[PDB]
Amino acid sequence: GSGVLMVGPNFRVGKKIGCGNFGELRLGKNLYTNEYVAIKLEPMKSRAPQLHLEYRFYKQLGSGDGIPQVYYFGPCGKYNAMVLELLGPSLEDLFDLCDRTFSLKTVLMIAIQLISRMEYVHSKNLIYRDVKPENFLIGRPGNKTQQVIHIIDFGLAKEYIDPETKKHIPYREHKSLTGTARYMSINTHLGKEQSRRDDLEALGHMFMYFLRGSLPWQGLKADTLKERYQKIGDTKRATPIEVLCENFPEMATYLRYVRRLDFFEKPDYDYLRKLFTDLFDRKGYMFDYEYDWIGKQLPTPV
Ligand SMILES: N#Cc1ccc2nc(Nc3ccc(Oc4ncccc4C(F)(F)F)cc3)[nH]c2c1
Numbered sequence: 001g002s003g004v005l006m007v008g009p010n011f012r013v014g015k016k017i018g019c020g021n022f023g024e025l026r027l028g029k030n031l032y033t034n035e036y037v038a039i040k041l042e043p044m045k046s047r048a049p050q051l052h053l054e055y056r057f058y059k060q061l062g063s064g065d066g067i068p069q070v071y072y073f074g075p076c077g078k079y080n081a082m083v084l085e086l087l088g089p090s091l092e093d094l095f096d097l098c099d100r101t102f103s104l105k106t107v108l109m110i111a112i113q114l115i116s117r118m119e120y121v122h123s124k125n126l127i128y129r130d131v132k133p134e135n136f137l138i139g140r141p142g143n144k145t146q147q148v149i150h151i152i153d154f155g156l157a158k159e160y161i162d163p164e165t166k167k168h169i170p171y172r173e174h175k176s177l178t179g180t181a182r183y184m185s186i187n188t189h190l191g192k193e194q195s196r197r198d199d200l201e202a203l204g205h206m207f208m209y210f211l212r213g214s215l216p217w218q219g220l221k222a223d224t225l226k227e228r229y230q231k232i233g234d235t236k237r238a239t240p241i242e243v244l245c246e247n248f249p250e251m252a253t254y255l256r257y258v259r260r261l262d263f264f265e266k267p268d269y270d271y272l273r274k275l276f277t278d279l280f281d282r283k284g285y286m287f288d289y290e291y292d293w294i295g296k297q298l299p300t301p302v
Contacts, residue, residue, distance in 0.1 A: 007081040008072045013039055017301035027301040028083060030071070036302050037071060038086045041079040050155035051080050057154040061124050066117045066150045068137075087150050088140050089298045091210075092133035098292045101213040104248070105285040106292045108276050110136075111207050113149045115276075118199050119269040121151070125161040128154070129194050131202030132180050133209070138291075141300070147289035160195055168264045169193065177229045182218055183209070186259065189233030197261035200272070204255040205236075208244055211251070216244065250279045 005013035007028065014027035017038075028039035042051035055073040063069065072083040091110065095102065102110070114136065121128055128151070135153050139145030156179060160169050172193045179188065185201035188194055209215045217235035222228035241259070245252035254275055261267060280287065 005077055007039060007076040007083055008074050011037065011039065011072065011081075011083050013041075013076060013081075015301070027086070030083075036086045038068075038084040039076075040082045040084060041076065042081075044075070044078050044080055049080075051082055054153070054155045054157070055082050057126060057157045060126065060159075061121065061154070064120055066113065066120070066148055068150055068152055086140060086302070087137040087152070088146055088300075089138065090134045091136045091138075091149070093299065094138070094291070094293045095133055095210065097296055097298070102210040102292050104211065104283065105280070107207055107210045108280045108285065109287055109289065109291065110149055110210070111203070112273055112276050112280070112287075114151075114203055115200070115269055115273050117149065117151050118203065119267075121157075122160075122196050122199070122267075125159050125163075126154070126157050127160045127194055127196055128157055128199045130154075130156040130179060131183050131199060131206060133206060141298075147291075158194070168195070171263045177226065181229055181232045182215060186233060186236050189229060189236065193263070195263050195265075196267055197258055197263070197265065200258040200261070200267050201255070204251070204258055208248070208251055208255075211248060250275045 007013055010030050010032040012029045012031055014029060016023050016026040018025045024041055026039045026041060028037045029035070030037055040051065040054075042049065052073060055070065058067075058070045061067055068087055069085040070082065071085070072081070074081060089097075118128065130153060135151060137150045137152055139148050139150065158169075161167070162169060170193075173191045175191050175193055177189070177191070183202045183205040185194070185198040185205075188198055188202075205215060216239050217232040220228060220231045220235060222231055241252045241256050245255060254272055257272070258267065
């Protein structure tokens with residue numbers, strides 16, 4: 001009789017926000033605290049549920065730097081809902097706002113943070129497997145973390161360390177392709193099980209995407225997803241790192257380091273961060289969080 005959707009005891013469900021979704025993400029308000037939140041909804045009728053174990057992955061991640069806080073997971077009408085800390089625009093939104101190219105200083109401030117972000121995820125025995133500009137969000141204007149790059153949507157995540165055996169998951173192939181083709185590692189294209197290295201290689205592709213404005217396999221189309229995947233993969237293998245990373249030696253070093261990582265191998269995150277901080281220092285940049293998108297006006301649902 002109210003006509004109003006509530007999630008849990010205190011979350012009023014608001015307008016849906018963002019692009020895509022199709023009703024899957026909505027603005028929300030914690031009526032008890034008078035704060036806005038993000039509410040991810042999943043029809044209880046879903047064929048491929050992801051919401052609640054994404055919730056479980058967040059539990060396993062725990063409170064962390066750059067990890068959105070999770071407040072609730074419960075039924076909402078014919079929806080299962082997960083209430084999350086509200087963040088700002090994604091790197092993709094910001095990219096468009098900056099005319100689809102970030103300065104090296106901005107990319108390095110982003111890269112240095114994400115390597116740490118991924119190392120954190122990996123330290124919790126999880127591999128991300130869904131790298132893309134759309135899943136990395138800055139904080140909100142004021143909520144103290146607007147300059148922190150956050151990582152969201154852990155629906156495609158996986159525990160790479162068996163919780164009982166305490167062993168790294170076994171190598172294997174023939175994994176079906178689903179993730180986003182543009183950034184995925186070459187091995188992902190080959191149908192191989194993803195591991196730590198693959199998250200790091202995807203980040204590399206994304207860093208070059210930001211620096212160049214686009215990637216050279218970006219416009220490939222085909223008659224079947226599998227074929228497209230295969231064409232993109234062929235081009236990635238056919239584009240020499242030194243050609244892709246032309247003018248960015250450190251990026252080339254980062255990329256072939258991760259490309260050559262063994263399946264079970266622990267990446268040397270310190271080594272990778274240093275490739276970028278040394279470069280950062282040598283260019284004379286100051287890590288002051290003044291990205292290319294500053295002064296600009298971002299979107300807000302509130
Ligand atoms: N899982 C998960 C998850 C958890 C928390 C989040 N916080 C946000 N932040 C957010 C910021 C602006 C926005 O709204 C917009 N974003 C981009 C262009 C235009 C608009 C709008 F048109 F609404 F202003 C929608 C959401 N996204 C989030 C996703």
